[PDB]
Amino acid sequence: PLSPLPAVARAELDARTEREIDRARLRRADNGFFRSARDVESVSPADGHAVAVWWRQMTKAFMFTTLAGLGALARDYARRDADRELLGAFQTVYQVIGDDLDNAAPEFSAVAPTGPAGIHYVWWDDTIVAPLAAHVTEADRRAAEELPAPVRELLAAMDRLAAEPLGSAVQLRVVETIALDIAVGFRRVYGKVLAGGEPVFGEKDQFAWIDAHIKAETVHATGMTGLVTDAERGEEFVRLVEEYAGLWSAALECFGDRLTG
């Protein structure tokens, strides 16, 4: 009564989706955040702090709206009869959300704090934002929380995706493609923040959030297209990926702009 598309139609949805991500210029060699993170010689505490505050809000919104999007899919499946292949892909989304919410993967539980302190936006706030905030004034702290326009547009697409039954599939499909390059970028950026000529992040353990993400993405991610049940949902999927990818690309370009200002 409710099945994925045959594997041939799905494979072409995957090729259309990867071409969407190419066209959005989200690849390692294309996007201005990755290039700036390699290129800049140093990063000021104020610039690093501001990017860290933006990322905190973006990662918080990614986690909660992806879960909300799984909620929307669950409302449908409560009354329909999803077959096992659909149920397996639904499970994958649940477990991938669980990394950011509860450090389900052993790569994260080995290093993350326990309880709510380990939620990834909170863990980022405690170990990346806070030491940077020690080195910016109160004025700059308030200014950093006035999010730039491309960041607000991304957050708003995420709220729209929180209601879609395909929304958690779109978000995970784009973010898990770019997560590794984002985390490596962060490792390069925060390795270059100096205050008074000394590194703000001087101890290895201070990078634990970032090093854990780099390792989890190097190793790991029933794919996301396994949640598409017909042809016209497939069109909807590709259309939503193109939009969401574009907004991620523009948000990441704002990080690169802030590091080269």
Ligand X SMILES: CC[C@H](C)[C@H](N)C(=O)O
Of residues 89-118, which lie at the interface with a copy of itself (CB under 8 A)? 90-91, 94-95, 97-98, 101-102, 104, 115-117
- Find which of ligand X, a copy of itself, Fe ion, none residue 42 binds, CB within 5 to 8 Å per kind: none
Q: Does 146 bind a copy of itself (CB under 8 A)?
A: no
Among 18, 30, 85, 243, binds a copy of itself (CB under 8 A): 85
CA distance 82 to 76: 9
Angle at 193 between CA 134 and CA 177, to 5 degrees: 110
Stretch that binds a copy of itself, among 3-11, 66-74, 172-180, 236-244 (CB under 8 A): 66-74
Q: Does 74 bind a copy of itself (CB under 8 A)?
A: yes
Contact in structure between 52 and 60 (CB atoms under 8 Å): no
Q: Does 95 bind Fe ion (CB under 5 A)?
A: no
- Burial level of 148, CB count in 10 A (0-12/13-18/19+)? middle
Nearer to ligand X, 4 or 49 (CB): 49
CA distance 226 to 9: 11
- Tokens encoding 75: 């409302």
CA distance 12 to 69: 24
Q: Does 173 bind Fe ion (CB under 5 A)?
A: no
Cβ-proximal residues to 161 (8 Å cutoff; 6+ apart), any chain? 65, 66, 69, 167, 168, 170, 171, 240, 244
Q: Least separation, in Å, of the C-beta of 99 and a copy of itself?
A: 11
- Tokens encoding 212: 């854990």
Q: Does 204 bind a copy of itself (CB under 8 A)?
A: no
Of residues 230-249, which lie at the interface with a copy of itself (CB under 8 A)? none
Nearer to ligand X, 186 or 237 (CB): 186
**CA distance to 10, 78, 241, per residue, from 6 (Å):** 6, 23, 20
Positions that interact with Fe ion (CB under 5 A): 100, 120, 220
Positions that interact with a copy of itself (CB under 8 A): 60-61, 64-65, 67-72, 74-75, 77-79, 84-85, 87-88, 90-91, 94-95, 97-98, 101-102, 104, 115-117, 119, 122, 158-159, 162-163
